[PDB]
Amino acid sequence: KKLTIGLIGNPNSGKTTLFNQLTGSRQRVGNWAERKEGQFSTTDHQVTLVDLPGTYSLTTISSQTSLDEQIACHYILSGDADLLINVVDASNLERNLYLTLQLLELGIPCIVALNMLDIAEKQNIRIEIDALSARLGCPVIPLVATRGRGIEALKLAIDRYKANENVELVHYAQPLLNEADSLAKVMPSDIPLKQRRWLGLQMLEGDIYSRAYAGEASQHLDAALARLRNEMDDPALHIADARYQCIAAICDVVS
């Protein structure tokens, strides 16, 4: 059974190194129409690993997006990957989980690969693996460097992979969910309900680039925002703050 896996993480998360270790000399360097692609095997699977450009987020709310960011986003939303391996820097967890949260809100099958365990230890940081997994609703695999043990556990997890656990991640105010869902109902229904509801939130948060994916929902954004502004100060801020609360709450328990 062949699997297509996207490798995604922040810049300087050790992603290039992990890609190289996983694929060895079974790799091929193309471009996105630089696009690195490689092969490896697990017990059950022949995996095609696709290296996505380093990025801190699938989008940018307050400022201009980058090319790398748009490439990652488009690939992720295309649904070409059967699952993703989200490489996370254990020494800068809070910053790294911003991207992770987006992947999980999108409902994309995910395996977190906790990297840079050494540097975390030398920064006096210990991550509670099962605490994080429980809260994210996906596997969390410590990438132990010694004798490539982390790689072997990562391959094990790929063979074990099922859907993410359907867990509440962010706790949004009810008017936000309502408005996002009603926007979602009008978006191109070729997109899954979960992603259309996320796009909805992104629109409400001021994400300009999400409007490209939302089609006819953009015609209803103004009316949704006016309503929300009559029951809370600034809907975009309530979205960002809830997301900050979620990630901060996780980090306090987990780190």
Residue numbers in the entry: 2 to 34, 39 to 260
What does the original paper state about this entry?
Structural studies have also illustrated a large conformational change in the G5 loop of the intracellular Ras-type GTPase domain (NFeoB) of the prokaryotic iron transporter FeoB, when comparing crystal structures of apo and nucleotide bound states. The G5 motif is generally comprised of six amino acids with a relatively poor sequence conservation, although the motif invariably forms a loop with electrostatic or hydrophobic interactions with the guanine nucleotide base. We have used the EcNFeoB (Escherichia coli FeoB) protein as a model system because of its clearly resolved conformational change in the G5 loop as revealed by crystal structure analyses. We systematically mutated the residues in the loop to alanine and characterized their biochemical properties in order to determine their individual roles in nucleotide affinity, GTP hydrolysis and GDP release.
